[PDB]
Amino acid sequence: PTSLKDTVKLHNGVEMPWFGLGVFKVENGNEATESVKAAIKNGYRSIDTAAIYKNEEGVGIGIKESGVAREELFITSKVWNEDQGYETTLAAFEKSLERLQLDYLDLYLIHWPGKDKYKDTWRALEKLYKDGKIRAIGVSNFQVHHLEELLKDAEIKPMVNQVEFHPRLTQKELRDYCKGQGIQLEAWSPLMQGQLLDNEVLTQIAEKHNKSVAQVILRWDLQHGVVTIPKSIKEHRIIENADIFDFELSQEDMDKIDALNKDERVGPNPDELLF
Amino acid sequence: PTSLKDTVKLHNGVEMPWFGLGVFKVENGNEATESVKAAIKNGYRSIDTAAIYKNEEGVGIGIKESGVAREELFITSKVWNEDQGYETTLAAFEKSLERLQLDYLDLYLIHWPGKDKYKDTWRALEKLYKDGKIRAIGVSNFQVHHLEELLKDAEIKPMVNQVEFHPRLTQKELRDYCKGQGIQLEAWSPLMQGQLLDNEVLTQIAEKHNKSVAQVILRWDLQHGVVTIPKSIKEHRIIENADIFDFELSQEDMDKIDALNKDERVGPNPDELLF
Ligand SMILES: NC(=O)C1=CN([C@@H]2O[C@H](COP(=O)(O)OP(=O)(O)OC[C@H]3O[C@@H](n4cnc5c(N)ncnc54)[C@H](OP(=O)(O)O)[C@@H]3O)[C@@H](O)[C@H]2O)C=CC1
Ligand SMILES: NC(=O)C1=CN([C@@H]2O[C@H](COP(=O)(O)OP(=O)(O)OC[C@H]3O[C@@H](n4cnc5c(N)ncnc54)[C@H](OP(=O)(O)O)[C@@H]3O)[C@@H](O)[C@H]2O)C=CC1
């Protein structure tokens, strides 16, 4: 990828922008509205939200007050754990549309696997897909197991798997499984919620390039072929974060970053989050 | 208790109405606002919401629109999982106050224990309690061990433990432990989210008494000395639900209902939901 507009093709030929804005822990109304606006105005073409983020309304208002045609925009949201099941997901989806002021979503993800209800929730996604309400359907926080089990009974293969991904948790096993299945990986907490931006191995590599630690990580994502969705509520970081198409990491750098892995999570394990 | 006004004394001498409005899955603004003031217009003096419900603004609005004195109302909210940690709990609590339009909460709860972050989530509750911004502090979906564990380092013991409780799930053990610890049990999902309203055994007992199953269940919560907070978005259900003070269940009835128990949940198990 050479710019912000750049796209990855999903197994159904839907072009998902390689880069995005996540809006988790961002507050409803103006914070979310302004962040969405600032990102779009600076060229982001991809927003990632969730029902549980509480901010679909402010995101939906950013989109509109943004000034870019809806169809040039790729909007994602997720069904929450509590609405899992066939009928309750259908209904959960429509509430997301209505808060978002959208007629369709570009991606809709199951938030978490959990225990029992995700196969029926998938059936619900598939139907919305067929009804033409969602352009792409996918999954979030799924292990190779869940995916194996999903696939027994799926009519549509998931297009995206959005998992926590960063130097500290590099997802080697799931990456190989997912690329072999034409399921695109997407990185959540790509910045490890900020916890890596003092990392000395990363700061030496940022130094060399004249870049921030956040940029390096973000470029590392791109060179591994993982869609990314960093979050910020500060406009200069939103710009700082997209400013990565003017340098590359060498194989040398890439492996060093990879040598940071502790298989280490700052958010829930999908195998421990059971409802 | 003999009326809607009736209260239980928590171990710090705070008086919590036995009966409340639960507001889970009720929509922000008009729906919330209207639910609340229909309840208050009919004598309810306790409302239970949470940060993660995201009707806290419509609740606060309905509180003020009802016209009743702050001091006569009992408002409960909860710190969500995503925001546990000492600093984030203080912050998350100021957010609940702000959008509730309250100066203090009557009760603030740890929503779920999870895995790691509850003990110092608690330190944050305690601090706010000493700053006199919360009249009572407590906990939700804690098991005997979470509580043993909390108590090893607490300066203040939980005054309320809010857990899922209904004939399918009669929380026998946990009730003995809280009773002995001076920790007030409170029932969430009291009607099992509507699942039992059609139960055969509760039906013959309702019929005999000239009440609905929902009332029978509700009277059963009280005769067990559990605070209860049924949810309805329908003003007639709200009124019905509180109309439980003019009849009583015998020892036969109580034991019959009790015998329903299947250790059966409609919501997550606290021991499984591991964030
Ligand atoms: N599918 C799922 O279950 C999950 C999905 N996600 C998705 O992933 C997205 C991003 O992950 P997220 O958890 O938000 O965290 P990130 O890893 O992207 O990091 C965000 C934190 O780092 C800071 N930060 C961002 N940019 C910079 C910068 N360049 N320099 C210094 N600090 C910076 C931010 O502060 P500040 O805002 O002040 O700038 C913020 O506090 C979420 O918004 C969400 O959409 C996240 C968790 C789970
Ligand atoms: N701490 C925690 O994790 C949790 C806390 N809670 C709290 O407890 C409260 C209880 O709500 P919840 O537990 O979800 O639901 P309940 O067990 O109170 O029952 C809610 C369901 O019963 C329905 N209902 C159907 N018929 C009747 C009737 N005949 N009379 C009265 N109600 C009827 C309501 O429909 P309708 O509204 O359309 O009338 C709704 O679908 C919550 O609202 C929340 O405050 C809930 C869950 C977890």
Curated annotation (Swiss-Prot), chains A, B:
NADP(+) binds at residues 189-241. The keyword NADP applies. Substrate binds at H111. Its EC number is 1.1.1.-, 1.1.1.283. Pfam families: Aldo_ket_red (PF00248). Reduces glyoxal and methylglyoxal (2-oxopropanal). Is not involved in the vitamin B6 biosynthesis. Belongs to the aldo/keto reductase family. This is Glyoxal reductase.
